Amino acid sequence: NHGLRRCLISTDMHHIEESFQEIKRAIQAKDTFPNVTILSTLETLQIIKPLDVCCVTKNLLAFYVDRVFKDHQEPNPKILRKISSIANSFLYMQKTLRQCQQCHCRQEATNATRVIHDNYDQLEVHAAAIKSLGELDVFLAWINKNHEVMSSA
Template identity: 35%
Template sequence: MKVFTAFFCTFAISFLLCESPVTEGKTLHFGACRLFVHFHDLKENFADIKHTIVSIPVLLSIRRVLRVEGPRNSKFGDSCCFLRHLLKFYVEKVFKQYPTVDGNIRTKTSSLANSFLSIKTELRKCHERNMCQCGEESRQKIEAILHAYKNMDVNAAATKAIGELDILLEWMEKYH
């Protein structure tokens, strides 16, 4: 009986751990650079703030770059560098300029920023080990995004960029 109880407890704990959102992550491959990302946390935080996003008709080029030009195109070889700069853009500009007075939304935004900062740090390490090459393509794409962002009202641009996080998360998860 004790053996059965011990076996059952071990099985139950193993099952609960396997079902835990903490284990929901993926190893992303950006060339030679590999990193583990907990998409469950990112998606959950984004879902909590997505309903507060006001639709802005001005097209910010993050959507265009990630949907049309880059992610499905296997020639996009410097995606590691592109992602590192894109996450830097989100951490240093978008999350800081996102206009919200709701404390819960600010907490979720802060969690996303911290997650992005962690991923960016790992990508920077890959870059330092020459595993993450930066080329003209990533430079041009980042410049296009920064240009579009600077030409919009600060609050509108930050809100639009936050609203396009689902595109970025999908790109990261499905194509790398």
């Protein structure tokens, strides 16, 4: 049913949000293409129906885990510790989502997702990874609006 919005309830948005707030300035300060958004799809209302939101959520989690987190090399240990915490949260969110799931990807959801990979691939890889990292607020806002998520805020 609409329950697909309950697959991340065990995730604590506040936890991720806080870890991110800690490095948000330092990471966003390195965004070399501010006039553009890698998560452009998440600034539109193209993905709002339950089934599409579930598909895009799992695609975005994989986008971060398999692409962003692999591509960003972080020499600052304090920043890396925060990003590890976020990464750990995302791994949990993927675990939770597995447990849940329907969640199939209709062609519109799939395309919405490819747009992001396509924007990402427009940039040099390290700039793409740090910029994506900087857009975590766009990702958290979208997750927040489309899922019953818990907050210890």
